């Protein structure tokens, strides 16, 4: 699909058997989701945003379905204003910016 | 990682 | 052009006569540039994201050229680690997300 940017590029994703809304974020290196329980062991990590650094839980090799497209990678869980799908997963589904 | 709200 | 996401989507922009490298960000509502003394009236504003909020100065109707594509709009200037071109300017250059 082709997505215009008049509205936030929010799409439905499936993760851990649950449905969630996430922003397709080209300005994010990583994928960060709001606090939720995910199967598997997690490692403490710190990432930076516009307002500073936050502590997150790092989950590896997690399958995520983005608008029907499959991806399996690192997912971070922590205090974020919105769920974001970063470049680590966007590259897996072949997402590109065009103009 | 930049949302910007 | 078509931009892949293997690396951060950084491109050259021109604002206030200066050439800069900025991140094309679909996850940014606004365009935020690192500290620079632009002439003109501005209004104080607060924007947030991961880590919290930061204070920025809002400048309106500023001409910005993104990869040869002209645009004009609101630009925020504050203590940001990177120059970010948000949706307010991306829509003007007909930028879309494709996968």
| Chain A neighbors of B1, CB-CB under 8 A | 25, 27-30, 32, 47-49, 84, 86
Pairing outcome for strands A10-15 and A53-66: antiparallel
Q: What does the block give as tokens for A83?
A: 């769920």
Distance of residue B3 Cα from the nearest chain C Cα, in angstroms:
5
Query: Can you list the domains of chain A with their CATH numbers?
Result: 1-99 (2.40.70.10)
CB contact under 8 A, A82 and B1: no
Q: What does the block give as tokens for A34?
A: 């709001």
Residues of chain A with a following break (C to N over 2.5 Å): none
Are C71 and C89 contacting, i.e. CB atoms less than 8 angstroms apart?
yes
Between CA A87 and CA A80 the distance in angstroms is 17
HEC string of chain C equals CEEECCCCCEEEEEECCEEEEEEECCCECCCEEECCCCCCCCEEEEEEECCEEEEEEEEEEEEEEECCEEEEEEEEEECCCCCEECHHHHHHHCCEEEC
Which of B2, B3, B5 has the highest number of chain C CBs within 10 A, making it the mutation to test binding with C?
B2
Distance of CA A36 to the CA centre of its chain: 13
Distance of residue B2 Cα from the nearest chain A Cα, in angstroms:
5
Are A29 and A86 contacting, i.e. CB atoms less than 8 angstroms apart?
yes
The order of strands in the sheet holding C2-4 is A2-4, C96-98, A96-98, C2-4
Between CA C82 and CA C65 the distance in angstroms is 17
C contact residues 61-80, partner B, Cβ 8 Å cutoff: none
Resolution of the model in angstroms: 1.9
């Amino acid at each position: 699909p082709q997505i215009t940017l008049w509205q936030r590029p929010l799409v439905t994703i499936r993760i851990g058997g649950q449905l969630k809304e996430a922003l397709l974020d080209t300005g994010a290196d990583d994928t960060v989701l709001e606090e939720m329980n995910l199967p598997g062991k997690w490692k403490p990590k710190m990432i930076g945003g516009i307002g500073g650094f936050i502590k997150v839980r790092q989950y590896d090799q997690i399958p995520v379905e983005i608008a029907g497209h499959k991806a399996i990678g690192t997912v971070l869980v922590g205090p974020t204003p919105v769920n974001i799908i970063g470049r680590n997963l966007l590259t897996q589904i072949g997402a590109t910016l065009n103009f | 990682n930049x949302p910007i709200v």
